[PDB]
Amino acid sequence: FPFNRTKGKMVRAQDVALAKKWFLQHPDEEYPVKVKVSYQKLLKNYVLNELHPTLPTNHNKTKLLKSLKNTKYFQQTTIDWVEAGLQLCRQGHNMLNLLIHRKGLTYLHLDYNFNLKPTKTLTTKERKKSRLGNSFHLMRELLKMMKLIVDTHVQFRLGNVDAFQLADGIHYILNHIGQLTGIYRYKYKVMHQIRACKDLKHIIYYKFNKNLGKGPGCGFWQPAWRVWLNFLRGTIPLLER
Amino acid sequence: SYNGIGLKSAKGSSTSGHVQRSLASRPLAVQKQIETHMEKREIEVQVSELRDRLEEEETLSEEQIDKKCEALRAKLTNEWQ
Amino acid sequence: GKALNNAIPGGPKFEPLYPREEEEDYNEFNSIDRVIFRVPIRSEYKVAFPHLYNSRPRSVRIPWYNNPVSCIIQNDEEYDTPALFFDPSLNPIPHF
Amino acid sequence: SFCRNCGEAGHKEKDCMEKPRK
Amino acid sequence: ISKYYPGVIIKVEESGEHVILGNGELYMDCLLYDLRASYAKIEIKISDPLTVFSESCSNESFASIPVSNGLSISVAAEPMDSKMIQDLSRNTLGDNPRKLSKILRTEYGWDSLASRNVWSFYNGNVLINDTLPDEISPELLSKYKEQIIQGFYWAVKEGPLAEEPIYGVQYKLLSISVPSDVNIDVMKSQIIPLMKKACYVGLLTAIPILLEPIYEVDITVHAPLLPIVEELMKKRRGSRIYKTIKVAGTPLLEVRGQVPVIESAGFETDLRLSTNGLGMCQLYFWHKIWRKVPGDVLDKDAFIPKLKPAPINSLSRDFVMKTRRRKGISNDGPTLEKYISAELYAQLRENG
Amino acid sequence: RTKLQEHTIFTQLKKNIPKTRYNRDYMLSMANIPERIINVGVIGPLHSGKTSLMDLLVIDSHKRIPDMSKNVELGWKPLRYLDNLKQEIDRGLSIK
Amino acid sequence: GIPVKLLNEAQGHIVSLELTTGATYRGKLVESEDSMNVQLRDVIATEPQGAVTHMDQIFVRGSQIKFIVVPDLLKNAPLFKK
RNA sequence: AGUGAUCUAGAAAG
RNA sequence: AAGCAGCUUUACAGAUCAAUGGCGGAGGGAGGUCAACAUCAAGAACUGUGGGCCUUUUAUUGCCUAUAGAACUUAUAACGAACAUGGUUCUUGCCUUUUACCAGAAC
Ligand SMILES: O=P(O)(O)O[C@H]1[C@H](OP(=O)(O)O)[C@@H](OP(=O)(O)O)[C@H](OP(=O)(O)O)[C@@H](OP(=O)(O)O)[C@H]1OP(=O)(O)O
Ligand SMILES: Nc1nc2c(ncn2[C@@H]2O[C@H](COP(=O)(O)OP(=O)(O)OP(=O)(O)O)[C@@H](O)[C@H]2O)c(=O)[nH]1
Ligand SMILES: [Mg+2]
Ligand SMILES: [Mg+2]
Ligand SMILES: [Mg+2]
Ligand SMILES: [Zn+2]
Hints:
Chain D is low in regular secondary structure.
């Protein structure tokens, strides 16, 4: 499946598990230890998914975007994806900055790459009053991740980097969230996603780099992209609450 | 665990749980009774042959067969002794 | 493999489903003075026939036994080999 | 053994760098 | 289980344990699943796989000694010819006396005397009453015929070495020495355990051996992978390949061979894994082949490891002693001293 | 309600016994006649298709079978009607 | 065609024949042929004179049969379906 | 004479 | 299988151009990254309806029997060939405390 068919239903792009068929099969015996343990760990994730099905409920009528669409306050249009990303970046920056300023913490500054830095060395009363929690920080770091992705697409559209560099850049970001983003500090369970991305990188590279050798250029970013989307699935209700 | 070797889990062991096989690893009296049995077997062998012939190809009466069968042994027992 | 806490190499590993162990057990039933050893019972056997080769197979699921042996011949050559042909792998048919 | 897709030795069909051809 | 599974044999030992016999590993897996999941619904311990052994002879009894509990019985044992074993295995010869004696005289080449003196065929063994008329007239032994045959049946259903069945033995009566005095109805009770003991003595005097059932194996494998299959058949003990069929019009070979049942544990799994799923095999016992285990059962000092599988020359001793300890019969093992007088035993040991 | 999913797929309700294409009483009406009954044993080696051969004969005899999924109507998967024990369904094998 | 098939689908049941000669026979139909030859067993028989007898087993040539009576059950046999 | 079995991982407040 | 006779008839031409019956016509088709409502894990497990049935009159439900139609989902059992998070309890791990966590189970 699916090649023995000639008709079917469309699936979501994130539902095409391209890399999955590799680690359901035996790895090539010559591979080094890190690749083999990567295969083994991805199999662990697959088996634990198959053991414990979380079946959906049928009375799930009030989807968010449809419910908002019924209102006079929300309107439709169509825009380019890079414009939508830039808009969402500006919007999220405005939201977090307004939250900072309503709480009176103008002595904290939010960068346009979503780092939060104090403008001055803070008093103890200022430190207690400005002690933002994991909700704010998780929100901030997700905006930071999205900002990185959008900025690579912006670089491509300015002509600064070509398409292959873009593919490699997206792949690098999704593999190196652990270094670029710091999101684990506020939700340490994301290390499962980071570990899954590392394992995926190992198996992808040792399929990809056969007879090529070392260096950048591998832009097959679809599996890690799926990892982070499926993380966002379960992060939506938590961050909403 | 594999083939009965190794930890329940690597978790909590402070080790990787890696396992590797160690390459460093004159006759007695009762014996004569068969010899006695053979000589008395011989008599019954010839009796059996004669009795089978009498039954199958010479006569129809049990008493006629039996006396002629016994005639062989009556002579052979002294013939060997 | 998870339920029995047995792992063939290459396969995943999990912490045991039943973390207890019958340390109270001492009985003669499987004493080495009574067991006939001829072949070591691999973990592969313990997952192939889980109810035969395990003493307490709690929560195991029965595996699919077998499929008929695959004989799907593939056409290697680009153009010169047609769809239907007697592949070199096949034994001949000498009967007449 | 050679790659039937391009004729070069060593690598398999699945690991070829030239595009597939019929 | 005994009702629903037609081919399964269930019996209970004097040890208090239950013994199940089945056709093979998948069969046992299925019925043990049924026990745990539908019918018993309790947790059940089980041994590693075993096999049904049987006990037999390799020579005629070195002495036809008398055996006594004043009544006495003497018997001797001798192996049945291979032709008769292979025919009687299939419940065929060549129960009317003249017909049976005809074919025994003809095809199996018996003496007419023994041919007419057959007294029972039972589970691959034969009892022959060659008792001479000089001590006991035919009429007097005829009074006891049914019950002495019952004793012989007890004897062949459980043997002296391991209480396993006897197979492939001719049992020959020398004499049953009967008192003139006692009422026969009580003497019925006395003769069946003494006939059991007499057959035990007769077999132990007959250079006893242990017999092992042999699976025949049919293996279907892709032809270029035959080296792996024959390597596996070399790794397993006692297994041999007899014929290879080139399956016409396919890439497959059908490979016919044999492997002992005790050696058969996980054979299918090893073959399927080594061949990467391009091979499969079937194990069956409809041709009922029984074969001598190597070594001598009466070898007291053979080397038997604690955990490794034992070497070849000690296999029979290892099987017999492990069966004896599991059944609770037992470190000395079987010997005639269990059954015969001490003076006779020591004299036999000295005389050899 | 008595439930049998733990052991076998089986029809407990008489209203759901499938309707034959032929009149079933007519079949009983000739059970009185020994010349009209044949008993057929479908034997053969492992995975020969015996249960599938039976699946052919069952489907052609009945109007609608409740256990038919669209995967079976379209022939992606065999019906395996007579392999109805849970253990047989799991092993992919006729056992009883 | 259907009538010869119905006479084959009648085998094993009790049928009643009437002949051109005016005789009547009633009994279990052991075998029937495409030519309408029939064999009957445990046969009640009747003469043209109306005299009645019994006989073990009979064969009848097809040409001489006037009509055959078949058990009413067969009206719902699968033979008649479209 | 050599088959394999490979835990981890960091931030806040106190 | 075509040459001829029967069924079907329709591009037609008729008797009829009346009395009939047959099939259509008395608010069209294809689509939508539109919406609402109903429904989707159960004796292998479906609803309506005619006759009979325990609730003291069997009502509408549960039972027997006759009969018409079942869309989607499912047997290497699931809407989804995909795969997240959270709560409670228990047992572990790291462990100076809580959050954040290690990873198995059950709900
Ligand atoms: O730590 P890993 O996950 O294994 O990945 C490491 C690198 O990632 P970073 O540490 O973030 O730089 C990676 O380059 P990148 O992904 O950044 O492009 C290299 O790939 P390549 O050189 O481009 O082929 C790997 O080399 P291989 O060993 O051949 O896989 C390297 O492994 P190593 O640390 O054992 O040397
Ligand atoms: N290619 C092919 N496969 C078939 C055919 N018939 C059955 N199979 C497959 O063979 C396998 C065995 O199917 P079964 O119908 O259970 O065969 P069986 O003879 O009943 O085997 P047992 O269960 O051992 O009795 C299944 O995977 C079927 O899909 C066939 O005609 N062609
Ligand atoms: Mg079958
Ligand atoms: Mg304090
Ligand atoms: Mg405190
Ligand atoms: Zn190539």
